[PDB]
Amino acid sequence: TLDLVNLGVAANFAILSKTGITDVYKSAITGDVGASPITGAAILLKCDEVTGTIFSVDAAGPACKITDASRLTTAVGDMQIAYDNAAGRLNPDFLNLGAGTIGGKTLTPGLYKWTSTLNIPTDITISGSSTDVWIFQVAGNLNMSSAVRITLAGGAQAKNIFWQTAGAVTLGSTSHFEGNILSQTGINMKTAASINGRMMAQTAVTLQMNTVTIPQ
Numbered sequence: 617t618l619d620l621v622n623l624g625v626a627a628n629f630a631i632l633s634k635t636g637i638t639d640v641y642k643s644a645i646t647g648d649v650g651a652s653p654i655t656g657a658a659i660l661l662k663c664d665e666v667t668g669t670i671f672s673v674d675a676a677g678p679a680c681k682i683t684d685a686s687r688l689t690t691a692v693g694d695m696q697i698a699y700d701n702a703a704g705r706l707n708p709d710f711l712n713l714g715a716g717t718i719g720g721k722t723l724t725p726g727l728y729k730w731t732s733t734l735n736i737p738t739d740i741t742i743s744g745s746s747t748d749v750w751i752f753q754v755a756g757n758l759n760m761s762s763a764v765r766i767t768l769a770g771g772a773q774a775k776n777i778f779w780q781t782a783g784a785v786t787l788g789s790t791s792h793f794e795g796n797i798l799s800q801t802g803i804n805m806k807t808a809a810s811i812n813g814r815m816m817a818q819t820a821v822t823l824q825m826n827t828v829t830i831p832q
Contacts, residue, residue, distance in 0.1 A: 618727055618749040621702045621778045623796070624694030625687065626816060630668065630830040632695055633817045637661060640807075640824040647814075647830030652688035656681055658820075668830075695816045699798045702751055702780035722769075729753040733783065736760040739767065742794065746771035750795070754781040758797075762788035762806070766795075774812045774831035787811070789824075796831070 626632055630647030636658030637651055643661070648668040651659055656672025663670070663680040672681045673688055709726035716730060719738030725748035733756035742750060750772075758781045768774065777795030779785075785799050789807040796814045797803055802822065803815045810827040 617747075618705075618725065618751060620749055620776065621698050621751065621796070621798075623698050623814070623816075625691040626695040626698060626814070629691060629814060629816070630828050631815045631821050632691055633815075633819065633821045634692060635820045638820060638822040639665065641665070643823045643826045643828065645826075645828040647828070650688050650691060652685070652692050656683075695798065696818075698816070699780060699800065699818070702778055702798055703753060703782070705751055705753070708753070719764075723750065725750055727751045727753070729755075731755045733757040733759065736764055736766075739765050741767045741769050742772050742777060743769040744772045746773055747776070748772060749776045750778065752777075752779045752795075754779065754783070757781065757783035758785045760787050760791050760793060763790045764788065765792040768794055777813070 629650055630645055631649040633651045635654050639660050643665045645666045650671035652673045655674055656677025659677050663678050670678055670681045671688055672683050673685045705727055708729040710728045716732050717735045722741040722743050725744040734754045774794045779795050780798045782800050784801045785803040787793055787805045787809045791809045793811040799817045802819045803817045804822040805826045807824045812829050815821050
C-alpha cells in the first residue's frame with residue numbers, strides 16, 4: 617500500500633493559493649480559504665460564498681476575513697512539502713497510461729505517472745477500498761472536459777486521492793472532480809464545475825460559479 621500524502625496545516629483548507637483567488641459570483645465553497653504571501657485583497661470572494669473562514673496575511677480582504685499570517689505561512693509551507701512529497705514518489709505502477717488521454721477508464725489504487733499533459737475527455741471511475749490511496753503525477757497540464765464526472769466506487773474516498781501537477785489544471789464547465797489537487801501553477805474552474813477535494817495552487821485559483829467542498 618501506498619502512503620498518504622500528508623498535507624499538515626493545509627488539510628484545513630478547501631482553497632489555498634499563493635497569488636490569490638478569483639471568482640465569478642456566485643460560488644459555494646465549504647471549508648476555509650486562504651492565500652499567502654500575497655495581500656488578502658487578492659481574494660475576490662464575498663463572505664456569502666464561503667462557509668468556513670477566509671484568512672488573510674494582512675488587513676486587506678473581504679469584510680469577514682481573519683488576519684493570520686503565521687498560520688497561512690505554515691499552511692503554505694506545508695502545501696509545498698506536500699507537493700514535493702507527491703512529486704517525489706518513486707516506482708510508479710503506471711507510466712503514460714492511455715497515452716495521456718484516459719476517458720472511460722476505471723483506475724485502481726496506486727501511483728500513476730504521466731510525462732506529458734493529462735486529458736480526461738469522458739467519464740472515469742476511481743475504484744478501490746476505503747483505505748486505498750491514489751497518487752496521480754502529471755508533468756504537464758491536467759485537463760478535464762465539460763460535463764465529465766469522476767465517480768468513486770468500492771468505498772474509495774476523495775481524501776485519499778492526490779493529483780500533483782507541474783502545470784495548470786483546467787476543469788471544464790459542469791464537470792465534477794474528486795480528490796486533492798496540488799498544482800505548481802494554477803487551478804482554473806469553469807462555469808458550474810464542482811469539486812469534492814482541496815485546491816492547493818502555488819499560483820492562483822480561478823473560479824466561475826463553482827461548488828467546492830472539502831473531502832469528509
